[PDB]
């Protein structure tokens, strides 16, 4: 019975779960970003610009309408950097679990 391959099986499965979390956050990042550019291009401030918050609406400037989407893109991208900071940490154990099968 080997407990290092018990760590080796846990290590490779943690590689898989991290990369999938990056991909779903990248598609949400471009979805908000391309939602910014389309609504600015059509009809800036003429009388009022209604903006959806559920089923009630607020009327204000065109650039503030982007600004709510701009913040969520900032929060999402900082996660993507932190996700890849965990993708890097799951690779260092992978180079070291090969020796620990010979050590203990």
């Amino acid at each position: 019975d080997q407990q290092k391959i018990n760590k080796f099986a846990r290590n490779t499965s943690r590689i898989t779960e991290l990369k999938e979390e990056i991909e779903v956050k990248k598609k949400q990042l471009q979805n908000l970003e391309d939602a910014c550019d389309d609504i600015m291009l059509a009809d800036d401030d003429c009388l009022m610009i209604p903006y959806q918050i559920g089923d009630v609406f607020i009327s204000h400037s065109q650039e503030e309408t982007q600004e709510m989407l701009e913040e969520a893109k900032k929060n999402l991208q900082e996660e993507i950097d932190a996700l890849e900071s965990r993708v890097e940490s799951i690779q260092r154990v992978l180079a070291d679990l090969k020796v620990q099968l010979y050590a203990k």
Binding site: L29, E33, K73, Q77, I80, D81, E84
Partner: protein
């Protein structure tokens, strides 16, 4: 593993190497026979050759004596040029002579020791046939047109040979003491006929650039470089690649327009009129080059750029590791001359008078590839003729000469070893039997006629094989190169003794 005994190995060496020697003696001589090519694998495609080297490439060789011959066939092919089919029959002519000795009782170390002494003795007889031709400009001009008909007709080109014969001997004449293949630029190109082929004094690139760039450059300064425009090379000027941000694209989009602007400033500060680039040149630096007078070449040849820095005295920029310390080439005239259907770049008046560019013009791909392979085999021999402007009298005339000298030494020495020297001098006379069979004549008559010639010492005349009659030597068209036979005599006597060395053959495959 299968341990082949010596009694079995001699039978295998005799069926292995001689049958290969049967094939190359067919495809010897322009009057000689040919060989159908049968592919050893499935779906056998057929070609008809007058070359034995291609036979080894198509038909697989797995005879252990004959696989030694494949190594010998490669050496005369690459390092020597012509003499591929000649060295392989000649070792087989030796091995046939060894058969009766093996049939008697005779050890091969008798046969080896005799042929080693007989080779060196005939080598001095080969040096006796060394006659200079660089003593005159005209006789060296007469020397080059002699051998140019010999190699090209030996490697399947005799119909438009004479148009290539006039052009090739001119470029070798400018080499003047130094044999050069890195000064003779070899260009094949589809277009025109084989009478449309061209010789440029200098260097050539097949670039159609028109009138957007300067194509007429007088008193050129040539920068030989590999510096691209969109590749973002070494000596960084702006942004580099990075991750984990979304607003850093603006520094990358702006930095490309600065690097292409700066490399125009880099190229102009060389002072050149011609920027030769291995890579693609973008449209915005290209239009900045033609207005000032800087020639722009994109998609340059990987080997042509390196041969350009040699012929012009310049140097490669080493992928923009040298931004200014890279030296410049200089030539007289750069002219765009339409040769055939294509627009060509002619670097004329380069710093090397040795430097030339032959321009091959084939009407199809079938004639164009076979012309260059024969022409490259010719120019290697002609470059060796620049170092040693010497001939030996072909048509088996030198073959009759050295076999007499061995026969004289075989009739002064003959202890144990010169039983082989008697078999040696026959195998030298076995080669003119082939050419008389290549011409298709009485080989027993023509040899014994030629044996009667060199017996008293009639050496200035051997057999002109176009009629098979005896004719002039020391230049005839048939008087061959000194450099060829001294390599062919070296290898054929060598590997045939090595075949005699391998009796302890073991097959483990």
């Amino acid at each position: 593993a299968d341990e082949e005994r010596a009694e079995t190995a001699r039978l295998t060496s005799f069926i292995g190497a001689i049958a290969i020697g049967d094939l190359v003696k067919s495809t010897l001589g322009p009057k000689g026979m040919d060989k159908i090519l049968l592919s050893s694998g499935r779906d056998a495609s057929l070609m008809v050759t007058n070359d034995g080297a291609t036979i080894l490439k198509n038909i697989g060789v797995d005879n252990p004596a004959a696989k030694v011959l494949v190594d010998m066939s490669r050496v005369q092919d690459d390092e020597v040029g012509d003499g591929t089919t000649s060295v392989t029959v000649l070792a087989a002519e030796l091995l046939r002579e060894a058969e009766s000795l093996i049939a008697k009782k005779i050890h091969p170390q008798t046969i080896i020791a005799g042929w080693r002494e007989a080779t060196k003795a005939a080598r001095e007889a080969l040096l006796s046939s060394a006659v200079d031709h660089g003593s005159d400009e005209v006789k060296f001009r007469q020397d080059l047109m002699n051998i140019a008909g010999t190699t090209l007709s030996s490697k399947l080109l005799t119909h438009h040979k004479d148009h290539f014969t006039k052009l090739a001997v001119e470029a070798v004449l400018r080499l003047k003491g130094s044999g050069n293949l890195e000064a003779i630029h070899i260009i094949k190109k589809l277009g025109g006929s084989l009478a449309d082929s061209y010789l440029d004094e200098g260097f050539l690139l097949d670039k159609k650039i028109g009138v957007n760039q300067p194509k007429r450059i007088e008193n050129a300064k040539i920068l030989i470089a590999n510096t691209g425009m969109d590749t973002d090379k070494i000596k960084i000027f702006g942004s580099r690649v990075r991750v984990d941000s979304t607003a850093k694209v603006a520094e990358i989009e702006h930095a490309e327009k600065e690097k292409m602007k700066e490399k125009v400033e880099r190229i102009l500060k060389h002072g050149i009129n011609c920027f030769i680039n291995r890579q693609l040149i973008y449209n915005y630096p290209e239009q900045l080059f033609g207005a000032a007078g800087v020639m722009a070449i994109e998609h340059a040849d990987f080997a042509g750029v390196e041969r350009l820095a040699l012929v012009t005295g310049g140097e490669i920029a080493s992928t923009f590791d040298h931004p200014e310390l890279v030296k410049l080439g200089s030539c007289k005239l750069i002219e765009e001359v339409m040769i055939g259907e294509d627009k060509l770049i002619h670097f004329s008046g380069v710093a090397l008078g040795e430097a030339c560019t032959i321009v091959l013009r084939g009407a199809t791909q079938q004639i164009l590839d076979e012309a260059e392979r024969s022409l490259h085999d010719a120019l290697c021999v002609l470059a060796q003729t620049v170092k040693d402007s010497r001939t030996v009298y072909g048509g088996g005339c030198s073959e009759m000469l050295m076999a007499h000298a061995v026969t004289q030494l075989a009739n002064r020495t003959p202890g144990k070893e010169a039983v082989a020297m008697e078999s040696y001098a026959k195998a030298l006379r076995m080669l003119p039997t082939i050419i008389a069979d290549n011409a298709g004549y009485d080989s027993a008559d023509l040899v014994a006629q030629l044996r009667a010639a060199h017996s008293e010492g009639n050496t200035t005349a051997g057999l002109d094989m176009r009629e098979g009659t005896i004719g002039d030597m020391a230049i005839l068209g048939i008087t061959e190169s000194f450099q060829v036979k001294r390599q062919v005599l070296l290898s054929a006597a060598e590997a045939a003794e090595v075949i005699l060395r391998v009796d302890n053959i073991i097959k483990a495959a």
